[PDB]
Amino acid sequence: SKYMTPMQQKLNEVYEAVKNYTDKRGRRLSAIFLRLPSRSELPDYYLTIKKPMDMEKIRSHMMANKYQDIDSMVEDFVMMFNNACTYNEPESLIYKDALVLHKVLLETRRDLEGD
Numbered sequence: 001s002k003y004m005t006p007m008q009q010k011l012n013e014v015y016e017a018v019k020n021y022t023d024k025r026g027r028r029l030s031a032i033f034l035r036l037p038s039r040s041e042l043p044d045y046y047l048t049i050k051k052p053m054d055m056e057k058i059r060s061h062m063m064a065n066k067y068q069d070i071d072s073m074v075e076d077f078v079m080m081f082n083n084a085c086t087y088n089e090p091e092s093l094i095y096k097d098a099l100v101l102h103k104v105l106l107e108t109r110r111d112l113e114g115d
């Protein structure tokens, strides 16, 4: 009950790798991605993005034990970063940060392929 299954441990490790990542200056890139603002605060996002995603949604799904494999969680992260890179321009910091975290995600999945 305290003890997570191997799949649960792996899901958590991937999630935490993205969440905890800090650049060389100590900035936690996940900060902005934790929770989307509301429809009144970010209207153009909701009018243009088909499938809203934030890390709270991912975390809630993980904590409900609803991901069956690592690929399913990775797909939600990838959706989130592609959403960020669709809504925001390439010159923007949120776009750039999404690309870094997307690399962190994939590198973490690859680092754990034998686990």
Ligand SMILES: CCc1n[nH]c2oc(=O)c3ccccc3c12
Pocket (backbone or CB within 6 Å): 032, 033, 034, 035, 036, 037, 042, 045, 053, 054, 055, 080, 081, 083, 084, 085, 087, 088, 094
């Ligand atoms: C202002 C917050 C923000 N602007 N553009 C965004 O794109 C996103 O994909 C996203 C995902 C989770 C939390 C915030 C944002 C976001």
